[PDB]
Structure formats: C-alpha cells, structure tokens
C-alpha cells in the first residue's frame, strides 16, 4: 500500500497505467514506486510555490493564475513546461525597459 513507501500518490494506479498505454510488455515492481515518488515530488514543488504566490496576492486559495506565476518564477519548471498553456493562466507582468517613459 502507499503507506509502505510513505507516499501519498497511489502506486497501484500508476502500476496499472504503466501496464497499459502500450509502454512495455512488463514491469519491475520498483518502477511505479520510483515514478510515484517523482510525480509526488514535482507536485509538491509546484504547489509549494503556488501557495506562496497565493499568499503574495493575500488569498487563502490557489487558482490557475497562481500556478502560472509560480511555474515561471522557477526557471527549472519554466524550462520543463516551456511549451504548456495554462487555462486562465494570464501572463507575466513583464514590460521591456525601452518602452517606458523617459
């Protein structure tokens, strides 16, 4: 059970998905365990940054906008998700200096 690996994500699900999707004939049982840990870890990284982003906007709740900002505020995730579009993400408040009045 997940309580064996101490993970929150459900291994047996992942295991069944790996059996399908035509990825391979067969599986070594460590596989879904390892993969579950990774998916959980990445999930935490996003949510943690997103919660901080929600706090900056003084909200107790995460909304797609906050995921968008939180992702782009970490260039590692920005690269990983460098082709993704987020529903209701909005964009970054970047204005190029050459446009400003002086």
């Amino acid at each position: 059970r997940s309580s064996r690996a101490g993970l929150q994500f459900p291994v047996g699900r992942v295991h069944r998905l790996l059996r399908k999707g035509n990825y391979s004939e067969r599986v070594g049982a460590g596989a879904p365990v390892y993969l579950a840990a990774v998916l959980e870890y990445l999930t935490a990284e996003i949510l943690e940054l997103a919660g901080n982003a929600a706090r900056d906007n003084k909200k107790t709740r995460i909304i797609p906008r906050h995921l968008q900002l939180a992702i782009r505020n970490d260039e590692e995730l920005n690269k990983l998700l460098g082709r993704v579009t987020i529903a209701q993400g909005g964009v970054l408040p970047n204005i190029q200096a050459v446009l400003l009045p002086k």
Binding site: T85, I86, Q88
Partner: protein
C-alpha cells in the same frame, strides 16, 4: 455561416498585443493577424475534426481539440487530458 473572420475585432486584436507588451500597433497589423489566426484555426480544427470523424462522432469534444493541439508542439492544460 459567413464573414465571422470580421468577428475578430480590432481592439480585441489590440488587447492581445497589450498582453504581448506592444506599445504601438500599425494599421496593417489587423489584417495580417486575421490571416495568421485563420491558418492556426484551420490547422487545429482540421486535425480535431479528423479525430472526431475517426471516432465516427458528429460532436467535437475538448479531448479532440487537446490532441489536435498537442501534436502541433503545444500542450494545453485544464480542459481534461
């Protein structure tokens, strides 16, 4: 129907360009934008329809669009998938 490309209206084009940080937009942009947007739509729809026809449905679903987008090198989150 017809003439809905004129439905992509000029200030709406401007607002998109404001998200792109654009400070001033020339008179010729709007036509060029419409042409570009049409091509993008044509490619996505054509593929989406193809998925729908393959399943022999008459109704295009979010998944059909999401897939049509994906393979064009562009993934969309938040509509399923």
């Amino acid at each position: 129907l017809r003439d809905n490309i004129q439905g992509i209206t000029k200030p709406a084009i401007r607002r998109l360009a404001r998200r792109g940080g654009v400070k001033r937009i020339s008179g010729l942009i709007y036509e060029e934008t419409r042409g570009v947007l049409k091509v993008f739509l044509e490619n996505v729809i054509r593929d989406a329809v193809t998925y729908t026809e393959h399943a022999k449905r008459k109704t295009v679903t979010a998944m059909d669009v999401v897939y049509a987008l994906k393979r064009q090198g562009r993934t969309l989150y938040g509509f399923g998938g």
